[PDB]
Amino acid sequence: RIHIGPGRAFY
Amino acid sequence: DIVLTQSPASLAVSLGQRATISCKASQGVDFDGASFMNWYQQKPGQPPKLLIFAASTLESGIPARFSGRGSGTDFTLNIHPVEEEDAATYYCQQSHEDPLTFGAGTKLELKRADAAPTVSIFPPSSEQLTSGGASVVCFLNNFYPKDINVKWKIDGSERQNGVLNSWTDQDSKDSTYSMSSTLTLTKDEYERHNSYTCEATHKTSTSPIVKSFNRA
Amino acid sequence: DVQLQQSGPDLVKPSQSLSLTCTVTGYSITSGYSWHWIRQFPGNKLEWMGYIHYSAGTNYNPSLKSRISITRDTSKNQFFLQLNSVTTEDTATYYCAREEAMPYGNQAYYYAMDCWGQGTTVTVSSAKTTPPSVYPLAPGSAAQTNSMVTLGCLVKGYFPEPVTVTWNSGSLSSGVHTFPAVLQSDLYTLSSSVTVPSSPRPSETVTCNVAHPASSTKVDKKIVPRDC
């Protein structure tokens, strides 16, 4: 799985 | 925006010592099993290099002397033991949301013995005066610590207009700092006064270090 | 390994447009998660500008949204930054960076900007190329107590950076301090000091050599004792 910030534009 | 506040802004450490740098976020950067706080190291004349990501994971090739810890809003970068090559600026950076933001940076500098500045003052050269300008220069070289207060005095009174200062970064060989202070005036203004004093207050002396010259 | 390289004008005039290119080698731009532009201001403050995502969608810093644009060229493997209506406040070092998936925890991945370019300095100014005025700085009015005597060289009002300053054509390298240039009403002023034994000056000649490549200027000033 991958961890991308919840506020990143392309979450 | 998530504002990152680093502490302290500057840290002087001796080799082999432990250095701890903090980073406080204005709101939590934790989410679904990860803390989105990364750390960068930047040496002068070089781009930032990723050190730690996701709060505590070291990037490949970074030595174990670096450790990151924290969660929520509070994070710390620790270096133990500190080595010569560690002198650099360190930044924390959050990837919890866009816009991505960085802290202002903590400069890790090397601690050395206190050194008083060697002060020299210089009258304007005739080549400049004959052209109508007058810059009086004062060099405050090889001192430590970095904090110094320089004041210009003309005929006994403090002058603040026309003063431009420039600092060097810590010297890589001797770890001292140097500074240049220039007072620029027109020739006419220059010739209305006689006594020019460059005065420095530094931790190394209870009395100001003073250098002067009289036009004549 | 992957390598990023910024290129573009180093000097732009106010209200014009700044355009920079980031060339990527050893990795295709279509494979990276996102490609970013970050700038660093004198004082070391880093401001993220924006990025182009793999989907080709972009996201910008709200502070720059009205005048920024990021595009990519899949063929030349480059991405670009366009910043309009620049002001002197836009003077900074510009970097491009790759955001890639890093191994995290137990077979997981975490995105981080792991590879940055070397950076490219951009100055925004309306100043004209101007050669420096080099002034010799001789001790107040004598020699002095014990061994060391400090001499100087003032390099005033030039544009653009940089100037190269040596002492005695490079022969004098120890005891030299060249200070960072500072802006003095749109022109740069920098100074250099050299500390030498009382036995060498004024008996031996000390000269500061100054080269300003932009204007092709080369000046050599001999520090001569002040004739009072």
XYZ file of C-alpha atoms in Angstrom:
455
model
C 0.000 0.000 0.000
C 0.992 3.672 -0.417
C 1.054 6.653 1.913
C -0.039 9.988 0.410
C -1.045 12.933 2.576
C -4.854 13.390 2.847
C -4.522 17.002 1.773
C -2.415 16.308 -1.315
C -4.248 17.539 -4.409
C -4.290 14.120 -6.011
C -5.031 11.957 -2.979
C -1.143 26.305 5.559
C 0.678 24.079 7.983
C 3.357 26.245 9.565
C 6.511 24.484 10.753
C 8.504 26.071 13.543
C 12.019 24.875 14.149
C 13.969 25.278 17.359
C 16.523 26.555 17.916
C 17.383 28.602 14.813
C 21.114 28.049 15.403
C 22.916 25.416 17.468
C 26.634 25.387 18.298
C 27.921 21.914 19.127
C 31.287 20.258 19.801
C 32.367 17.162 17.875
C 31.148 13.896 19.404
C 28.317 15.695 21.179
C 24.568 15.088 20.783
C 22.508 17.611 18.836
C 18.702 17.725 19.006
C 16.670 19.902 16.633
C 12.905 20.288 17.061
C 10.113 20.887 14.548
C 6.604 21.856 15.629
C 3.679 21.741 13.192
C 0.686 24.097 13.487
C -1.653 21.092 13.127
C -1.204 17.319 13.125
C 0.579 15.673 10.223
C -0.395 12.069 11.114
C -2.775 10.084 8.904
C -3.750 6.487 8.328
C -0.531 4.915 9.631
C 2.085 7.545 8.745
C 3.462 10.829 10.039
C 4.145 13.044 7.038
C 7.253 14.816 8.330
C 10.549 14.645 6.457
C 13.972 16.175 7.138
C 16.490 17.699 4.718
C 20.145 18.626 5.208
C 21.704 21.407 3.166
C 25.350 22.290 2.936
C 26.303 25.671 1.431
C 26.363 25.618 -2.348
C 24.402 22.361 -2.451
C 20.742 21.461 -2.873
C 18.797 19.978 0.076
C 19.440 16.210 0.501
C 16.706 14.003 1.922
C 17.739 12.551 5.287
C 14.670 11.106 6.943
C 11.142 10.562 5.657
C 7.931 9.554 7.393
C 9.291 10.896 10.667
C 11.803 8.115 11.463
C 13.000 6.348 8.327
C 16.553 6.970 7.128
C 17.091 7.369 3.424
C 19.638 4.930 1.901
C 23.217 5.850 2.574
C 22.521 8.154 5.520
C 24.438 6.985 8.599
C 22.709 5.735 11.744
C 24.018 8.764 13.681
C 20.852 10.455 12.473
C 17.553 9.483 14.099
C 14.141 11.014 13.786
C 11.255 10.612 16.171
C 7.915 12.167 16.991
C 4.282 12.184 15.964
C 1.307 14.485 15.764
C 2.745 17.974 15.887
C 6.081 17.411 17.634
C 9.150 16.034 15.860
C 12.881 15.943 16.590
C 16.009 15.184 14.599
C 18.929 13.836 16.637
C 22.541 13.520 15.645
C 24.846 11.554 17.909
C 27.674 11.729 17.762
C 28.072 15.019 15.855
C 30.815 14.940 13.219
C 32.606 17.681 11.319
C 30.663 16.892 8.165
C 27.373 17.518 9.968
C 27.703 21.299 10.019
C 24.811 22.275 7.775
C 21.343 23.676 7.742
C 18.562 21.220 8.566
C 14.927 21.616 7.566
C 11.766 19.719 8.481
C 9.119 19.501 5.754
C 5.481 18.351 5.861
C 3.795 16.318 3.103
C 0.418 16.009 4.871
C -1.211 18.449 2.457
C -0.568 20.919 -0.345
C 0.911 23.423 -0.152
C 3.975 21.501 0.997
C 5.828 23.663 3.534
C 9.272 23.725 5.132
C 10.486 25.035 8.444
C 12.810 28.038 8.372
C 15.837 25.890 9.182
C 18.261 25.195 12.010
C 21.911 25.936 11.327
C 24.225 23.419 13.040
C 27.539 25.164 13.662
C 30.718 23.962 15.349
C 31.689 25.208 18.777
C 35.207 26.551 19.293
C 37.005 28.742 21.832
C 35.908 32.358 22.149
C 38.000 34.659 19.951
C 37.970 38.463 19.998
C 37.619 40.199 16.615
C 40.677 41.863 15.022
C 39.231 45.288 14.087
C 40.648 47.520 11.354
C 39.212 50.828 10.113
C 40.007 52.436 6.751
C 39.610 56.060 5.585
C 38.314 56.588 2.020
C 41.020 56.250 -0.602
C 41.896 59.410 -2.514
C 40.743 57.787 -5.730
C 37.203 57.651 -4.392
C 37.239 61.060 -2.706
C 38.419 62.813 -5.864
C 35.304 61.358 -7.505
C 32.986 62.760 -4.848
C 32.267 59.627 -2.816
C 33.454 58.524 0.624
C 33.201 55.007 2.019
C 34.756 54.270 5.386
C 35.354 50.554 5.916
C 35.682 48.503 9.064
C 36.713 44.863 9.159
C 35.962 42.767 12.252
C 37.801 39.543 11.493
C 38.050 36.041 12.963
C 35.799 36.174 16.013
C 33.650 33.688 17.861
C 30.794 33.548 18.885
C 28.908 34.989 15.927
C 27.000 37.599 17.953
C 28.522 41.047 17.689
C 27.162 44.577 17.834
C 28.829 47.181 15.574
C 28.199 50.910 15.854
C 29.566 53.777 13.793
C 30.221 57.063 15.506
C 31.012 60.311 13.756
C 32.433 63.013 16.003
C 31.060 61.030 18.952
C 27.494 60.486 17.717
C 25.941 57.242 16.493
C 25.295 57.095 12.772
C 22.900 54.511 11.305
C 22.020 55.888 7.878
C 24.436 54.689 5.201
C 25.661 51.580 7.013
C 25.890 48.257 5.136
C 27.147 45.091 6.819
C 28.202 41.794 5.319
C 29.030 38.564 7.165
C 30.978 35.489 6.152
C 29.702 32.025 7.119
C 31.665 30.077 9.759
C 35.157 29.382 8.449
C 35.649 25.675 7.652
C 39.269 25.650 8.935
C 39.180 27.737 12.099
C 35.456 27.985 12.800
C 35.438 31.751 13.304
C 33.290 34.428 11.738
C 34.262 37.652 10.016
C 32.345 40.781 9.214
C 32.620 43.908 7.081
C 30.826 47.190 7.858
C 30.863 50.103 5.431
C 29.597 53.628 6.020
C 29.032 55.417 2.712
C 28.772 59.204 2.531
C 29.252 61.916 -0.046
C 32.649 63.712 -0.001
C 30.986 66.885 1.295
C 29.401 65.104 4.263
C 32.693 63.302 4.876
C 34.634 66.549 5.067
C 32.182 68.090 7.555
C 33.451 65.671 10.181
C 36.765 64.673 11.670
C 36.479 61.680 14.012
C 35.321 58.339 12.617
C 34.902 55.442 14.972
C 33.991 51.818 14.350
C 32.917 50.331 17.666
C 32.256 46.643 18.366
C 30.678 45.031 21.388
C 31.483 41.342 21.707
C 31.191 38.674 24.407
C 35.006 38.561 24.733
C 35.325 41.964 26.425
C 33.361 44.067 28.900
C 34.532 47.199 27.101
C 33.815 47.988 23.428
C 36.536 47.293 20.892
C 37.166 50.683 19.290
C 39.043 51.778 16.152
C 39.166 55.347 14.931
C 40.915 57.841 12.746
C 40.766 61.590 12.432
C 40.552 63.138 8.960
C 43.335 65.355 10.330
C 20.798 7.009 -11.309
C 18.473 9.956 -11.995
C 19.878 13.458 -12.478
C 17.955 16.730 -12.716
C 19.326 19.948 -14.206
C 17.808 23.458 -14.192
C 18.630 25.860 -17.018
C 17.286 29.233 -18.036
C 18.183 32.905 -17.940
C 20.086 34.076 -14.857
C 18.810 37.633 -15.290
C 15.267 38.838 -15.932
C 13.878 42.377 -15.838
C 10.920 43.338 -13.625
C 7.406 42.628 -14.986
C 8.804 40.204 -17.611
C 8.378 36.413 -17.538
C 10.813 33.920 -16.068
C 11.006 30.540 -17.822
C 13.127 27.696 -16.513
C 13.657 24.158 -17.778
C 14.416 21.046 -15.741
C 16.011 18.322 -17.835
C 15.799 14.817 -16.400
C 18.293 12.152 -17.292
C 18.278 8.462 -16.445
C 14.582 8.328 -15.549
C 11.565 9.265 -17.644
C 9.235 11.952 -16.411
C 6.192 9.753 -17.115
C 7.385 7.297 -14.421
C 7.699 9.744 -11.567
C 4.802 10.473 -9.238
C 5.252 14.243 -9.356
C 7.770 16.803 -10.508
C 8.260 19.939 -8.422
C 9.687 23.467 -8.523
C 10.958 24.878 -5.224
C 12.792 28.159 -4.762
C 15.220 29.301 -2.082
C 15.544 32.944 -1.073
C 18.653 34.659 0.302
C 18.434 33.877 4.024
C 17.698 30.250 3.120
C 13.876 30.222 3.262
C 12.501 27.495 1.008
C 9.197 28.070 -0.743
C 7.556 25.199 -2.629
C 6.074 26.542 -5.882
C 4.036 23.722 -7.372
C 4.145 20.430 -9.302
C 2.938 18.493 -12.323
C 1.537 15.091 -11.303
C 1.852 11.896 -13.405
C -1.689 12.482 -14.688
C -0.342 15.769 -16.101
C -2.587 17.635 -13.662
C -0.891 20.420 -11.720
C -1.142 22.018 -8.280
C 0.325 25.371 -7.305
C 1.194 27.280 -4.172
C -1.808 29.634 -3.548
C 0.661 32.520 -3.260
C 1.832 31.989 -6.825
C -1.318 30.649 -8.493
C -2.156 33.832 -10.413
C 1.160 33.956 -12.227
C 2.599 30.451 -12.422
C 2.456 27.643 -14.935
C 4.136 24.220 -15.046
C 4.162 22.032 -18.149
C 6.108 18.987 -19.302
C 7.588 17.631 -22.507
C 7.462 13.845 -22.539
C 9.752 13.606 -25.561
C 12.633 15.803 -24.421
C 12.022 14.510 -20.880
C 11.760 17.992 -19.403
C 9.350 19.975 -17.285
C 9.097 23.746 -17.149
C 8.338 26.660 -14.900
C 6.807 29.890 -16.106
C 6.449 32.721 -13.589
C 4.903 35.941 -14.905
C 5.171 39.513 -13.711
C 8.341 38.936 -11.762
C 9.494 41.535 -9.252
C 12.882 41.881 -7.527
C 11.304 39.732 -4.782
C 11.499 36.756 -7.156
C 15.312 36.799 -7.001
C 16.161 33.353 -5.675
C 17.753 30.007 -6.406
C 15.358 27.722 -8.308
C 15.347 23.952 -7.969
C 13.408 21.136 -9.603
C 12.781 17.952 -7.697
C 11.321 14.474 -8.115
C 8.786 13.016 -5.699
C 9.144 9.210 -5.709
C 7.762 6.229 -3.704
C 10.214 5.237 -0.954
C 10.072 1.846 0.849
C 8.217 2.277 4.121
C 7.343 0.049 7.084
C 6.222 -3.438 6.154
C 6.084 -3.555 2.348
C 4.482 -0.123 2.091
C 5.529 3.003 0.205
C 5.717 6.666 1.127
C 6.110 9.579 -1.282
C 8.961 12.059 -0.774
C 11.034 14.512 -2.897
C 14.242 12.521 -3.083
C 16.184 13.961 -5.946
C 16.813 17.657 -6.506
C 18.636 19.477 -9.250
C 21.766 21.515 -8.605
C 19.745 24.742 -8.558
C 19.929 27.819 -10.731
C 20.249 31.394 -9.458
C 17.961 33.983 -11.014
C 18.242 37.684 -10.352
C 15.413 40.015 -11.291
C 16.683 43.539 -11.853
C 16.452 46.464 -14.228
C 20.106 47.404 -13.676
C 22.486 47.640 -16.610
C 25.745 45.761 -16.840
C 28.085 48.110 -14.951
C 31.800 47.596 -14.240
C 33.056 47.906 -10.637
C 35.032 50.796 -9.177
C 37.977 49.303 -7.285
C 39.446 51.297 -4.397
C 42.640 50.436 -2.495
C 42.263 50.313 1.289
C 45.550 51.233 2.984
C 45.939 51.359 6.801
C 44.598 54.473 8.387
C 47.886 56.314 8.303
C 50.935 54.209 9.138
C 52.119 50.683 9.961
C 51.463 49.447 13.534
C 52.195 47.529 16.709
C 53.434 44.027 16.013
C 53.390 41.558 13.147
C 50.072 41.690 11.327
C 48.793 44.529 9.138
C 45.368 44.357 7.428
C 44.861 45.829 3.979
C 41.723 45.957 1.906
C 40.124 46.385 -1.457
C 36.651 47.892 -1.992
C 34.760 46.767 -5.128
C 31.887 49.198 -5.500
C 28.842 49.538 -7.783
C 28.939 46.699 -10.274
C 26.319 44.526 -11.929
C 25.690 41.750 -12.233
C 27.429 39.319 -9.908
C 30.009 37.967 -9.644
C 33.456 39.477 -9.352
C 36.572 37.440 -8.706
C 39.035 38.949 -6.250
C 42.592 37.713 -5.718
C 45.600 39.149 -3.996
C 48.965 39.188 -5.737
C 47.520 37.089 -8.568
C 46.704 34.266 -6.169
C 50.092 34.122 -4.463
C 48.499 35.559 -1.314
C 45.871 33.054 -0.216
C 46.258 32.863 3.558
C 44.635 35.546 5.706
C 42.158 36.605 3.036
C 38.482 37.356 3.698
C 36.261 38.217 0.793
C 32.800 39.234 1.941
C 29.474 38.505 0.260
C 28.281 41.302 -2.011
C 25.427 43.502 -0.788
C 23.005 45.613 -2.854
C 23.533 49.345 -2.657
C 20.805 51.009 -4.745
C 20.644 48.409 -7.515
C 24.365 47.845 -7.728
C 26.575 45.433 -5.820
C 29.330 46.365 -3.410
C 31.775 43.843 -2.008
C 35.030 44.133 -0.015
C 38.054 41.919 0.572
C 40.680 41.983 3.318
C 44.146 40.477 3.520
C 46.338 40.239 6.612
C 50.095 40.135 6.088
C 53.198 40.480 8.286
C 54.478 44.016 8.973
C 57.718 42.993 7.238
C 56.044 42.481 3.798
C 54.135 45.757 3.491
C 55.006 48.472 2.699
C 58.389 46.985 1.732
C 56.832 44.486 -0.699
C 53.963 45.270 -3.009
C 50.490 43.890 -2.323
C 47.950 44.079 -5.151
C 44.245 43.210 -5.300
C 43.190 41.861 -8.702
C 39.546 42.205 -9.609
C 37.806 40.577 -12.559
C 34.224 41.298 -13.600
C 33.497 38.783 -16.432
C 30.146 40.371 -17.361
C 31.857 43.575 -18.480
C 35.203 41.904 -19.295
C 36.838 44.176 -16.706
C 40.198 43.278 -15.067
C 41.669 45.817 -12.631
C 44.728 45.576 -10.433
C 45.121 48.073 -7.578
C 48.409 48.326 -5.730
C 47.910 49.110 -2.041
C 50.252 52.034 -1.542
C 50.763 53.749 1.813
C 48.633 56.845 2.320
C 50.404 60.114 1.514
C 49.127 62.417 4.292
